[PDB]
Amino acid sequence: ARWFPKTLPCDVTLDVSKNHVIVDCTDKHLTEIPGGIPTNTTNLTLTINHIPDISPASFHRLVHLVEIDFRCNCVPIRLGSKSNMCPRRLQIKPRSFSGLTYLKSLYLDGNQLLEIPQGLPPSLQLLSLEANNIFSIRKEQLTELANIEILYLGQNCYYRNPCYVSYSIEKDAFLNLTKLKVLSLKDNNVTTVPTVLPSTLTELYLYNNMIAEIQEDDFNNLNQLQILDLSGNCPRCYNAPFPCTPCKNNSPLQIPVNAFDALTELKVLRLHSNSLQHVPPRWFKNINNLQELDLSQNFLAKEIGDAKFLHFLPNLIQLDLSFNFELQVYRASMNLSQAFSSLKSLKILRIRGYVFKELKSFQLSPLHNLQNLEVLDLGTNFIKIANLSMFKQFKRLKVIDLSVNKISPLYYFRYDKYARSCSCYKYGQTLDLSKNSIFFIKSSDFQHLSFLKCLNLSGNLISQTLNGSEFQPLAELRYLDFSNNRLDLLHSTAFEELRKLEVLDISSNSHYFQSEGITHMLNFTKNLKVLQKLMMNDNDISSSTSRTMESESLRTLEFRGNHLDVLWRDGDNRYLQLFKNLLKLEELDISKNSLSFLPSGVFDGMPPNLKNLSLAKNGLKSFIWEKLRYLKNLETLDLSHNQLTTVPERLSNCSRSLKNLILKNNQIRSLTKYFLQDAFQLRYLDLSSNKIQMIQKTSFPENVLNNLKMLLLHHNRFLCTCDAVWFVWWVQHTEVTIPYLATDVTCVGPGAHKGQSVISLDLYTCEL
Amino acid sequence: ARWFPKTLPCDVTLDVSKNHVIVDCTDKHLTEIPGGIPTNTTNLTLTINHIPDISPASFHRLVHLVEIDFRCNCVPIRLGSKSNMCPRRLQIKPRSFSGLTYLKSLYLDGNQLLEIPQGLPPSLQLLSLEANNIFSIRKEQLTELANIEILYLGQNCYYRNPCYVSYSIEKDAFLNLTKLKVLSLKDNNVTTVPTVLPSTLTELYLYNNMIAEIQEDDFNNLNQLQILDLSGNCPRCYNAPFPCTPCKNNSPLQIPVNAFDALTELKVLRLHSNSLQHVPPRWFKNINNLQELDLSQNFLAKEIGDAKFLHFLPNLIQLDLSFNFELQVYRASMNLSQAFSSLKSLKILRIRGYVFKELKSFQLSPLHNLQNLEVLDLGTNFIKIANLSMFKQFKRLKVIDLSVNKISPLYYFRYDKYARSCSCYKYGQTLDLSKNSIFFIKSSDFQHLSFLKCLNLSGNLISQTLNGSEFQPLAELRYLDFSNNRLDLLHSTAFEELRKLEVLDISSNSHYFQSEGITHMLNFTKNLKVLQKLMMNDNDISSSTSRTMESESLRTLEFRGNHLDVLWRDGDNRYLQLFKNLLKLEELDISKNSLSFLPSGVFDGMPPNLKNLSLAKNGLKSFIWEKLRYLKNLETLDLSHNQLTTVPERLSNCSRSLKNLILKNNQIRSLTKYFLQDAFQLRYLDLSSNKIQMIQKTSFPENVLNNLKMLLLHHNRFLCTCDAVWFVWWVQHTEVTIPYLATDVTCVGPGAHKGQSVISLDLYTCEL
Ligand SMILES: *[C@@H]1O[C@H](CO)[C@@H](O[C@@H]2O[C@H](CO)[C@@H](O[C@@H]3O[C@H](CO)[C@@H](O)[C@H](O)[C@@H]3O)[C@H](O)[C@H]2NC(C)=O)[C@H](O)[C@H]1NC(C)=O
Ligand SMILES: CCC[C@@H](CCO)Nc1nc(N)nc2c3ccccc3n(Cc3cc(CN[C@H]4CCOC4)ccc3OC)c12
Ligand SMILES: CCC[C@@H](CCO)Nc1nc(N)nc2c3ccccc3n(Cc3cc(CN[C@H]4CCOC4)ccc3OC)c12
Ligand SMILES: *[C@@H]1O[C@H](CO)[C@@H](O[C@@H]2O[C@H](CO)[C@@H](O)[C@H](O)[C@H]2NC(C)=O)[C@H](O)[C@H]1NC(C)=O
Ligand SMILES: *[C@@H]1O[C@H](CO)[C@@H](O[C@@H]2O[C@H](CO)[C@@H](O)[C@H](O)[C@H]2NC(C)=O)[C@H](O)[C@H]1NC(C)=O
Ligand SMILES: *[C@@H]1O[C@H](CO)[C@@H](O[C@@H]2O[C@H](CO)[C@@H](O)[C@H](O)[C@H]2NC(C)=O)[C@H](O)[C@H]1NC(C)=O
Ligand SMILES: *[C@@H]1O[C@H](CO)[C@@H](O)[C@H](O)[C@H]1NC(C)=O
Ligand SMILES: *[C@@H]1O[C@H](CO)[C@@H](O)[C@H](O)[C@H]1NC(C)=O
Ligand SMILES: *[C@@H]1O[C@H](CO)[C@@H](O)[C@H](O)[C@H]1NC(C)=O
Ligand SMILES: *[C@@H]1O[C@H](CO)[C@@H](O)[C@H](O)[C@H]1NC(C)=O
Ligand SMILES: *[C@@H]1O[C@H](CO)[C@@H](O)[C@H](O)[C@H]1NC(C)=O
Ligand SMILES: *[C@@H]1O[C@H](CO)[C@@H](O)[C@H](O)[C@H]1NC(C)=O
Ligand SMILES: *[C@@H]1O[C@H](CO)[C@@H](O)[C@H](O)[C@H]1NC(C)=O
Ligand SMILES: *[C@@H]1O[C@H](CO)[C@@H](O)[C@H](O)[C@H]1NC(C)=O
Ligand SMILES: *[C@@H]1O[C@H](CO)[C@@H](O)[C@H](O)[C@H]1NC(C)=O
Ligand SMILES: *[C@@H]1O[C@H](CO)[C@@H](O)[C@H](O)[C@H]1NC(C)=O
Ligand SMILES: *[C@@H]1O[C@H](CO)[C@@H](O)[C@H](O)[C@H]1NC(C)=O
Ligand SMILES: *[C@@H]1O[C@H](CO)[C@@H](O)[C@H](O)[C@H]1NC(C)=O
Ligand SMILES: *[C@@H]1O[C@H](CO)[C@@H](O)[C@H](O)[C@H]1NC(C)=O
Ligand SMILES: *[C@@H]1O[C@H](CO)[C@@H](O)[C@H](O)[C@H]1NC(C)=O
Ligand SMILES: [Cl-]
Ligand SMILES: [Cl-]
């Protein structure tokens, strides 16, 4: 019961520990900075709005501002929306920030600014101007930035935001920025490394530019540099999903052998997409502490067989040599140099896109004595032959990725993977054979791999009847992903040999369930004694030879995308207890099952400890709410995206346990006279995207509403007459979390109030 | 134009040739028979309504009625809707039909009637009472039906509508119906064949009942019977998707060897699901003209190897022996008796569910000299081995169906396939290998099958790179369905060996298009010189090594369910001419491509003779209508299911050629002041399911409206104030076809008029 309503259209959060007062106006369709922002405000965000200008009046009384995030108010035409394009660039009038003597961070990204904003305070430490039209850096313009530490100037001249000229940087422009630790000139059409840079730099990003050559003294003084990224300079353009111009004559980024000599503190070096053909060992003579090295998207296929530079990298943790194939050569085998054995500290090795026919156990011998190896990733290689038992010498590894290959009996290709916008590994040893050509499996295929905890066979061609003899060696397996295959449940003994299996995914195995007259045994769960979660989604199951699935251990069953409307056809009582004998089942998802109505017997036939039930996306035109009494342990009920028109006359007389009721996206036009009356256990209600016009005090008593952790009411049809005087008042003074209060809890009428937010409504005329 | 607006909520059609005045009120949410039904009404339909009763007042002035279809006004609870269930059964008061001396057909199905309606006219020829609660037929109740010819009484006692007792029929109940040609007692829980039946019967349906035995004289006088159906009497219940009780001891329907002796005119005999183990030749001794014989769902696996009864069936056109497998036996081969060679007139032979491992050429030798054979269907048999070249001896056949099998290098199971409710074969010789386990193809697999005109490999495991050497023998192929496979377009020479190919379906081959960095050649079309239609739907295509698809012959390209939003990413002009060089393309479907906006260059890059363009289901939030000038041959533009808010200022200025414009399911709230001014080519406009409130005279000129073949306006937000005086008058007096005028062209306001149809609106108060 607030004494003064919050009318501001922004989320205000108070952080007493750090003396901070955060005001978040992200995406609030604002044409001006809202009035009445708290005076003690420290963090102000106005991202994704259409405020045309900033002036001294903008932050006149907000003298305690430490951060102003004013991003994407005039986002460039090719990056922003087309339905609501920006007419004119952001206008920053003089002395707009000079008064803010406490300002530490200022983001003015995506505003089509032509020049670096002047008159900034001396307390500024972070300045961000990405996605603007600033493509000429002059020493005089950066004079004001004396105490700056982080400076982002990238994305000011690239294919999604062209400047039509080369990027210009004056000589020694950043040299007097004596506190500059991070500098980013990425995606800018830069032709040379700007010099001289301040020696205090720790991170330098110059990727996706027109730098054809590095001079031997471009980084002669950066003795504190930790991260250096020179990627996408002379790019490898084969199959680039963005406009890509390589250097003439297919030449690489020319780097002198002594260019990195002063970088004794370098930890990360990224040379991705530089068309490199050789990696000279001399580069790493003085770089002893190098931890991460990205050499993906180059022409280093032959170099992988020699790789003498690896002898100078004993502290390297991550090595990426992906997509280095020779454009027209399908190699017979992978040639890994014996130098890979000198990478004592290596944890992650990725060599996707090498492209070779057969993997043999000996080819991986340089990796045998790398005690800290955790990930070996050989995905996207078109490997047709590989004895899976070879991985018995890699029991220590956490993940062995052979995804996207041909074995049988967006990351490397995106332009900027760090572009700013406005799983079973936890179980243990994982062998990923997903998206491969395995059509038949037998126990011998998994010999010597008893240690595996997860096996992902998702997306293979497995059209087979499993009888409990295909995975006999996998005695420790806890997770099997068998999705996107053609499983034939002819026998109820399928998967029984995997005695320690906790999670089984057989989703998207619809093939045999689509043809009539075929036997399906869904009672195979009885034999899996420690199974916790079974997913059998999108199988199109409309028939079953067995009438009951049984299990003493299963806690979650996902059965979405099936045809329970056909199994539970009215007049056919045979499958009404299909899930009843899953005695420890707590979560059942039967959404997307075309259940227009739930026959009588579905609720009585549910397992006894059912906590979360989803009936979403079913086209449910009716629901006997009284039947919820059978589900004595129900905590969450999800009836979203259906065609329900009414709520229960008394929710208390339906379920004593129900905590979370989700009714979003239905046709409810009114709540019953005493809906939540005496339903004190309810802690979450969603009635958003319905067609409710009125909500009275009897249907929504305050003794229940105040207990709610959250209440969603947005996108309804609220009629704002004097009869809604209670709803409008309570919404304005409630402490209960109602998301979208000031942006989507709107009046549809009458006349004057059409489109008006209920939070800003003044019904004083109703009381005179 | 019309002087008197049509206010009746039913479709009135006049057929001057056959002199009928048809009034169709199907599904019009009527609680009473509407007033003002024309006095000349001959055919009146009131199906799917909630009219609680019929009385003499119902058809008082409609003395010329020839047909009354009053079905499903109180449909049984298990068959009907649950959101709006029927409270009480239909009440027919006395003398309701006695006055209608011209009544020929009366349908009172699905009304929960307890007894046969009495007081019917002597002119009635067809009476239908299916899905009611009439399960006791007495001779006295049928005396009024003296001149009846067709009588449907089925579905009055089965699992979806139980009566809890056996069906009773009095002795000689139908005997005095001396004109009865069709009698149907299907799905009724009947225990014996009713006798004596009138000899004038031509069709008798007694399927899905509890008839355990036929007496030798049950059909002793039906010398004019043409169709006899005794299916589902002692049913085969293995994998029945409905409640199925077989006869005790697994015994069949007992039919004496001489039971069909009097049936010299029998053309169709259906013995589906009768658990038959033998078919005695003696049954067909006196049946010489039998044309159709259904023996599916029996236990005739061993009988198929002997089948001596086939020697008495030389005039049989259709033979069905599907789903006769021995429950626990997977046979090594199919044993077809040599007696099949005596079926001289056979055109269709279906033997699905026989279940056998190998198909050998000599096993089909009884079929070699059957000159009229057109269809051989061996689907759902789990055949693992079959030399496709064996079909060289079946060039005369139209369809060879081997769908749903394991070959590698609802119809038979529904309860009542005739239950009433309230393709490449045209190209020539078709070989259907769909839903099989073929993972690799080579030219030798199609040797000796050069005659094939269609080959359906849909839903196989083909993960391969085609280079133009896999289908070398198929020189006459006009249609290849390759959908639901894993095609790898590494080479642009894919499919080029099929030189006479006119239609190619490579839809749902998304596997290789989903992983990054893989080469895809979409320019393979250039080599196919007579290709007319290419479907490459739902492939998730977001990248392509080739920038242009070329073709001198392609007329239709379906590219829905792909990612043209990524290929045409703003700033990337490389794929804007992807479809430009398809010089003879007339229809392009680029719906479901996530195109929120169309970049500049898409319209200019379209082929020159593009006539039909679909951009439906894209989430298009904006559209530069002026760009339609580039599409000089445009005739149909489909922009349905998008987020467009405005129509062009003057459509005629955007496109001189456009004829059909579909804008259904958008956010259009108003039409521009001169929207259709001078749009002389427009013949079809769809503005339904939008949010339009007002339409003025200037937006809809009479010279353009009178040329429209159809105009859709339903499901809008029409405000019915005095400002809508033009639109309300125009809708009432126009002759233009506007569908759903009395069920969905409604007023949303103001107040009083909420929910009212605009056709029934009286705005006389606007002019005083
Ligand atoms: C087709 O006709 C048969 C009879 O020929 C109907 O079966 C009969 O159904 C009733 C009601 O379900 C059964 O009676 C009940 O039996 C139980 C168990 O003894 C008892 O607790 C009830 O109070 C009641 O007496 C009756 O036994 C049963 N008869 C036979 C021979 O099965 C059948 O329902 C009809 N089919 C349909 C679809 O209506
Ligand atoms: C219309 C399909 C009918 C079903 C019936 C199964 O209950 N068959 C099948 N239903 C499914 N879901 N899959 C398959 C299947 C997959 C591969 C090969 C043949 C296959 N059959 C054929 C079949 C097999 C057997 C196996 N026998 C061995 C078991 C241990 O010792 C003997 C017995 C009777 C059979 O049909 C009569 C079926
Ligand atoms: C990251 C994958 C990159 C692409 C590159 C294609 O330009 N490869 C592939 N792209 C697709 N879409 N599929 C396959 C593929 C399928 C099965 C086996 C290997 C496969 N490769 C591998 C490859 C093959 C060749 C075969 N050449 C013979 C053809 C006739 O004479 C020479 C040449 C270079 C190759 O990569 C270097 C690819
Ligand atoms: C409010 O502004 C301050 C200053 O810009 C933000 O402080 C940064 O917080 C992160 C941790 O989240 C630290 O790693 C940085 O070093 C801090 N920067 C500075 C300059 O102190 C703070 O996160 C902002 N709070 C919100 C909620 O926006
Ligand atoms: C990067 O700079 C180059 C020039 O160094 C820009 O290329 C020029 O673009 C104009 C306008 O299209 C042409 O008239 C010139 O001929 C181009 N010069 C050269 C040498 O190519 C290029 O547009 C810039 N990149 C971006 C994304 O703006
Ligand atoms: C109007 O009623 C007549 C009589 O019930 C219908 O006539 C049937 O027409 C079909 C098709 O021409 C014939 O096969 C039937 O034999 C006719 N039945 C009788 C009893 O004559 C006619 O179809 C009805 N028209 C409509 C549109 O409902
Ligand atoms: C491996 O590749 C190197 C060149 O990179 C070559 O010198 C060497 O002979 C190759 N060895 C094998 C076994 O392929
Ligand atoms: C696979 O490798 C194991 C040894 O790791 C060996 O015992 C087995 O025979 C091999 N199988 C094949 C087919 O090479
Ligand atoms: C298996 O791999 C697929 C991708 O091929 C991935 O979507 C899925 O999440 C993986 N399974 C698990 C359990 O991580
Ligand atoms: C399972 O099938 C394999 C062959 O695929 C066979 O060796 C084994 O005996 C079968 N299991 C049982 C229990 O019959
Ligand atoms: C599944 O049901 C079938 C009968 O329908 C039975 O033979 C089989 O033993 C059942 N499976 C289990 C694990 O109980
Ligand atoms: C679903 O059940 C799990 C426990 O099995 C629980 O943690 C989770 O909160 C439930 N879902 C919801 C939405 O409450
Ligand atoms: C609770 O609901 C049931 C069913 O709707 C009803 O019969 C009963 O009277 C209700 N309880 C009270 C106290 O009204
Ligand atoms: C075919 O089946 C019949 C029985 O139906 C049997 O008499 C005959 O020997 C069988 N012949 C072959 C070749 O299998
Ligand atoms: C398939 O049958 C043809 C004869 O029609 C024969 O020439 C060919 O060798 C057979 N192929 C196989 C694999 O047996
Ligand atoms: C191929 O078979 C599938 C069913 O397996 C069917 O949907 C499709 O229409 C068939 N193709 C043609 C061209 O008829
Ligand atoms: C196509 O593949 C076949 C089988 O591998 C091969 O013999 C043939 O040479 C290939 N075609 C071309 C043009 O290389
Ligand atoms: C398809 O494009 C590639 C280059 O991307 C070219 O080599 C090939 O010849 C093209 N194919 C045709 C049929 O034009
Ligand atoms: C026009 O093309 C559409 C596809 O965009 C097609 O569905 C429609 O039937 C075509 N109509 C005519 C008259 O050609
Ligand atoms: C569009 O309208 C203007 C004004 O009448 C006219 O000058 C222009 O030629 C028109 N364009 C087309 C394509 O009809
Ligand atoms: Cl079993
Ligand atoms: Cl090629």
The answer to whether B578 and B609 are in contact (CB under 8 A) is: no
Task: Give the separation between CA A11 and CA A8, rounded to whole angstroms.
Answer: 8
Please give the C-alpha separations between residue A564 and each of A524, A537, A556, A744, B411, in angstroms, as whole numbers: 19, 12, 18, 36, 19
Closest to B665 measured CA to CA, from B640, B692, B693: B640
Main-chain dihedrals φ then ψ at residue A45, nearest 5 degrees? -115, 125
CATH topology (fold) of A1-768 = 3.80.10
Nearest to B699 by CA among B676, B665, B722: B676
Strands B11-15 vs B20-24: parallel, antiparallel or unpaired: antiparallel
φ, ψ for residue B365, nearest 5 deg: -65, -30
d(CA B501, CA B475): 9
Tokens of A206: 């110059």
> Which helix H or strand E contains A744, and what residues bound it?
helix A741-744
Is the peptide bond preceding residue B196 cis, with omega within 30 degrees of 0? Answer: yes
Rounded to whole angstroms, the Cα distance separating B80 from B111 reads 10
Distance A379 CA to ligand 3 centre (A): 15
Determine the Cα–Cα distance for residues A479 and B304; give it in Å rounded to an integer: 47
**CA angle at residue B410 from B406 to B415, to 5 degrees?**
130
Distance CA B765, CA B768 (A): 6
Pocket test for ligand 9, best of A432, A502, A533 (most atoms within 8 A of CB): A432
Annotated resolution, angstroms: 2.5
Residue B357 has phi, psi (to 5 degrees) of: -75, -50
User: Among candidates A87, A92, A73, which has minimal Cα distance to A29?
Assistant: A73
Q: A464 contacts in B (CB within 8 Å)?
A: none
Nearest to A187 by CA among A210, A218, A214, A213: A210
Q: Distance between CA A160 and CA A189 in Å, rounded?
A: 12
> Residue A192: which residues within 8 A CB-CB, separation 6 or more?
A211, A213, A215
Query: In this complex, do B570 and A78 lie within 8 Å of one another by their Cβ atoms?
Result: yes
| Best of A21, A65, A66 for a ligand 4 pocket test (most atoms within 8 Å of beta carbon) | A66
Q: How far is B273 from chain A (nearest CA, A)?
A: 13
Q: Is A406 annotated as a binding residue?
A: yes
Q: How many CB pairs under 8 A join A and B?
A: 119
Alpha-carbon distance values, B582 to B112, B428, B487, B530, B586 (Å) = 60, 27, 22, 13, 9
| Nearest Cα residue to A548 out of A526, A518, A527 | A526
CA distance A452 to A476: 6
B82 appears as a binding residue in the annotation: no
Q: What distance in Å separates the CA atoms of residue B446 and residue B72, rounded to the nearest whole number?
A: 53
User: How far is Cα A103 from Cα A145, in angstroms, rounded to an integer?
Assistant: 12
Structural determination approach:
X-ray
* Cα B544 from Cα B546, distance rounded (Å): 5
Task: Please say whether the beta carbons of B559 and B534 come within 8 A.
Answer: no
Which secondary structure element, helix H or strand E, spans residue B148, and what is its range?
Answer: none
- CA–CA distance, A574 with B679 (Å, rounded to integer): 61
**Pairwise CA distance, residues B668 & B414, whole Å:** 45
Q: Is B488 in the pocket of ligand 3 (CB under 6 A)?
A: yes
Give the integer Cα–Cα distance in Å for A106 and A129.
9
Cis peptide before B750 (omega within 30 of 0): yes
**HEC sequence for B362-405:** HHHHHHCCCCCCCEEECCCCCCCEECHHHHHHHCCCCEEECCCC
The answer to whether B574 faces chain A, any CB pair under 8 Å, is yes
Degrees to nearest 5, angle at CA B250 with B249 and B256: 95
Q: CA-based angle A105:A110:A111, to the nearest 5?
A: 90
3-class secondary structure, A128: strand
Q: Is A104 on the interface with B (CB under 8 A)?
A: no
**CB distance B43 to ligand 20 below 6 Å:** no
> Is the separation of the CB atoms in A591 and A558 below 8 Å?
no
- What letter represents residue A80's amino acid? G
Q: How far is the CA of A635 from the centre of ligand 12 (A)?
A: 8
Q: Supply the DSSP symbol for B647.
A: -
Backbone angles phi, psi at A732, to 5 degrees: -70, -35
Q: What is the dihedral of CA A653, A657, A662, A668, to 10 degrees?
A: 0
Task: Please tell me whether B445 is known to bind a ligand.
Answer: no
CB burial of B44-66 (b: ≥16 within 10 Å; e: otherwise) equals bbbbbbebebbeeebbeebebbb
Residue B121 token pair: 């006219």
Per the CB < 8 A criterion, the answer to whether A411 and B516 are in contact is yes
- Of ligand 8's atoms, which has the minimum distance to the CA of residue A392? 5
Contact A483, A534 (CB under 8 A): no
The verdict on a CB contact (< 8 Å) between B241 and A545 is: no
Chain A residues close to B569, C-beta within 8 Å: 160, 242
Helix (H, G, I), strand (E, B) or coil at B69: strand
Query: What are the two backbone dihedrals, phi and then psi, of residue A203, each rounded to the nearest 5 degrees?
Result: -140, 130
Give the residue whose CA is nearest to atom 31 of ligand 3.
A328
Residues in Cβ contact with A584 at an 8 Å cutoff, skipping those fewer than 6 apart: A551, A552, A553, A554, A555, A607, A609
Q: Does A463 touch chain B (CB under 8 A)?
A: yes
By three-state DSSP, how is residue B626 classified? helix
How many whole angstroms separate alpha carbon A649 and alpha carbon B336?
66
Q: Is the distance from the beta carbon of residue A597 to the nearest atom of ligand 5 less than 6 Å? A: no
A518 vs B: CB within 8 A: yes
A482 CA to middle of ligand 22, Å? 34
Give the tokens for residue A142: 């950066």
CB atoms within 10 A of CB A677: 18
What CA–CA distance (Å, rounded) separates B741 from B716?
12
A439 touches chain B (CB under 8 A): yes
| CA-closest candidate to residue B109, choices B141, B145, B151, B144 | B151
Q: What is the CA radius of gyration of chain A?
A: 32
Contacts of B423 (CB under 8 A, 6+ apart): none
Nearest residue on chain A to B511, alpha-carbon basis: A435
**Given the structure tokens 């690799």, which residue do they identify?**
B440
Interface of B with A in 710-749 (CB under 8 A): none
Contacts of A11 (CB under 8 A, 6+ apart): A22, A23, A24
Give the end-to-end CA distance of chain B in Å, rounded to a whole number: 24
Question: Which residue in this structure is represented by tokens 């995406």?
Answer: A27
- Residue A191, judged by CB atoms within 10 A of its CB (0-12, 13-18, 19+), counts as middle
- C-alpha separations of A731 from A742, A761, A764, B23 in Å: 11, 11, 16, 53
Q: Which pairing describes strands B268-270 and B430-432: parallel, antiparallel, or unpaired?
A: unpaired
Q: Which of B26, B104, B105, B111 is nearest to B74 (CA)?
A: B111
Query: φ and ψ at A141, to 5 degrees?
Result: -65, -30
Q: State whether residue A82 sits within 8 Å of chain B by CB.
A: yes
| Number of residues written out for chain A | 768
Closest CA to A260 of A229, A234, A304: A229
For residue A635, give Cα distances in angstroms to A603, A662, A709, B573, B738: 15, 11, 14, 53, 50
B-chain residues within 8 Å CB-CB of A298?
A: none
Domain boundaries, chain A: 1-768
Return the percent helix, strand and coil in chain A, to nearest 5: 10, 15, 70
Is B666:B639 a contact under the CB 8 Å cutoff? yes
Q: Contact B495/B524 with Cβ under 8 angstroms?
A: yes
Least CB–CB distance from B159: residue in A353, A435, A571: A571
Q: Residue A261, annotated ligand binder? A: no
At A342, phi and psi to the nearest 5? -85, 5
Q: Which residues on neighbouring strands pair with residue B749, listed in sequence order? A: B719
Please give the residue of chain B at the shortest CA–CA distance from A435: B511
Cβ–Cβ < 8 Å for B200, B221: no
Q: What would the two tokens of residue B597 be?
A: 């906006």
Distance in Å, CA B9 to ligand 6 centroid: 23
Q: Is residue B464 lining ligand 3, measured as CB closer than 6 Å?
A: no
Nearest in space to B568 (alpha carbons), one of B534, B531, B594: B594
Under DSSP, the state recorded for B145 is G
Per-residue CA distances from A203 to A129, A137, A180, A223, A231 (Å): 17, 19, 9, 11, 14
Answer whether A716's CB lies under 8 Å from A692's CB: yes
Tell me whether strands A20-24 and A11-15 are parallel, antiparallel or unpaired.
antiparallel
Which of A339, A337, A344 has its CA nearest to residue A372? A344
From start to end of A544-659, where are the E strands? 556-558, 587-589, 612-614, 636-638
Q: Using CA of residue B108, residue B111, residue B117, residue B120, what is the dihedral sign?
A: negative
What three-state secondary structure class fits B479?
Answer: strand
Residues 6 or more apart whose Cβ sits within 8 Å of residue B273: B231, B232, B235, B236, B296, B297, B298
DSSP B689-747: SS------TTTS-HHHHTT-SEEE--S--EE-SGGGHHHHHHHHH--S--TTTTTS-BE
User: Is B160 at the interface with chain A, CB within 8 A?
Assistant: yes
Please confirm whether the linkage preceding B280 is cis (ω < 30° from 0): no
φ and ψ of B637, to 5 deg:
-120, 115
Smallest CA-to-CA distance from A391 within A409, A376, A371 is with A376
Residue A417, annotated as binding a ligand: no
Please give the backbone phi and psi of residue B689, each rounded to the nearest 5 degrees, phi first.
Answer: 55, 50
Q: How far apart are CA B571 and CA A163, in angstroms?
A: 12
B328 CB-near residues (< 8 Å, 6+ apart): none
In this structure, what DSSP letter does residue A427 have? G
Instruction: Return d(Cα A722, Cα A694) in angstroms, integer.
Output: 11
Residues 6+ apart with CB under 8 A from B415: B159, B187, B208, B232, B242
Instruction: Please report, for residues B74, B639, B726, B736, the alpha-carbon distance to residue B671 in angstroms, rounded to integers and kept in the order given.
Output: 43, 16, 15, 19
* Contact status, residue B336 vs residue B370, Cβ threshold 8 Å: no
The span from the CA of A78 to the CA of B600, in Å, is 11
Number of H helices, E strands in chain B: 3, 39
Strand partners, B711: B685
Is the Cβ atom of B165 under 6 angstroms away from ligand 1? yes
Closest Cα of chain B to A543: distance in Å?
6
* Residue B386 β-bridge partners: B359
For B702, counting Cβ atoms within 10 Å of its Cβ (0-12 exposed, 13-18 middle, 19+ buried), the class is: exposed
Alpha carbons within 13 A on the beta-carbon side of A258: 3
Contact B613, B659 (CB under 8 A): no
Cα separation of A754 and B8, whole Å?
Answer: 35
Token pair, residue B605, equals 């890059």
| CA separation for the pair B579, B313 (Å, rounded) | 57
A162 neighbourhood in chain B, CB within 8 Å? 571
Q: Is A653 in the pocket of ligand 13 (CB under 6 A)?
A: yes
Contact status of B101 with chain A (Cβ, < 8 Å): no
Whole-number Å distance between alpha carbons of A416 and A197 = 24
Element (H, E) at B705: helix B702-705
Residues whose CB is less than 8 angstroms from the CB of residue A735 and which lie 6 or more positions away in sequence, other chains included: A1, A2, A706
Rounded-to-integer distance, Cα B750 and Cα A292, Å: 69
Phi, psi of A386 (to 5 degrees): -165, 115
A461: contact with B, CB 8 A cutoff: yes
For residue B319, give the H/E element and its range.
strand B318-320
Question: How many other C-beta atoms are found inside a 10 Å radius of the C-beta of residue B420?
Answer: 16
Strands B684-686 and B660-662: parallel
Task: Kindly state the tokens that stand for B565.
Answer: 């939003």
Task: State both tokens at B645.
Answer: 């808010």
Q: How far is CA A755 from CA A210, A695, A720, A751, A762, in A?
A: 50, 18, 10, 9, 14
Q: Which of B239, B439, B569 sits opposite A439 (nearest CB)?
A: B439
Strand partners, B503: B479, B533
Q: Which residue lies with its CA nearest to atom 14 of ligand 10?
A: A467
